[PDB]
Amino acid sequence: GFNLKVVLVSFKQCLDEKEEVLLDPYIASWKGLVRFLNSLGTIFSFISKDVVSKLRIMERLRGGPQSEHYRSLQAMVAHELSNRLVDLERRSHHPESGCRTVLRLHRALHWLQLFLEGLRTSPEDARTSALCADSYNASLAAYHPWVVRRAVTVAFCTLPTREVFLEAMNVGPPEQAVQMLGEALPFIQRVYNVSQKLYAEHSLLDLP
Ligand SMILES: CCCCCCCCCCCC(=O)OC[C@H](COP(=O)([O-])O)OC(=O)CCCCCCCCCCC
């Protein structure tokens, strides 16, 4: 009985009382997003492979000798920076740092949030190719080479309609799915904002 509503609302668990982003809950929530993306097939399932790999990087960090330093994004940043465990110019001495890894998860979260919000506010039976491509352009297209940008863009050229994506959320007919997103999306948005502010704060938005 998997449904997207539980996944989205689970993002509330990612922020504690002190507005810190907890990594374990964040990982769990992402696994739920990946399962939804996988259900879609084609381009979505393929791109989700990166997320899976990066989640496992974070799970290894969280299960290692410095585990508690990765309890929250806040703690991770303080640990890796103060101990110089993050490649600042190019990927070399710590190419899979928690900092640069979570950044890629965070960028992917941006794309997914825009896609979902785009679905929420689109007209019935809307084509979804434009929405997918624009959400991509506004999120992580800027980090891809031209030939990759072009390929992704065309990858969405023939996509199911808005209705299919909503019904895939398994929370009722389209209209109910739309209401659900209105209610649940705020939770992801909040986690994204704190994360974004954290990275902006330490000048980490362009880690290699
Ligand atoms: C609505 C959708 C929401 C989706 C949310 C999830 C989106 C995930 C974000 C995209 C993931 C991604 O860009 O990964 C790039 C990876 C990793 O690179 P890096 O970010 O670690 O530097 O680099 C690689 O993957 C390298 C291998 C690339 C092989 C591709 C072969 C096909 C090339 C054909 C184009 C010409």
Residue whose CA lies nearest to ligand 1 atom number 5:
108
- 125 assigned ligand-binding residue: no
Q: At what resolution in Å was this solved?
A: 1.9
Q: Is 49 labelled as part of a ligand binding site?
A: no
Q: Domains in the chain, start-ordered, CATH in brackets?
A: 1-208 (1.10.3520.10)
Nearest ligand 1 atom to alpha carbon 135: 1
**Residue 103: burial class (beta carbons within 10 Å; 0-12, 13-18, 19+):** buried
Encode burial over 184-194: b for 16+ CB neighbours within 10 A, e otherwise. Answer: bbebbebbbeb
Structure tokens at 45: 């399932």
Residue 68 pairs in a beta bridge with: none
> Which atom belonging to ligand 1 lies closest to the Cα atom of 33?
5
Cα(62)–Cα(98) distance, integer angstroms:
9
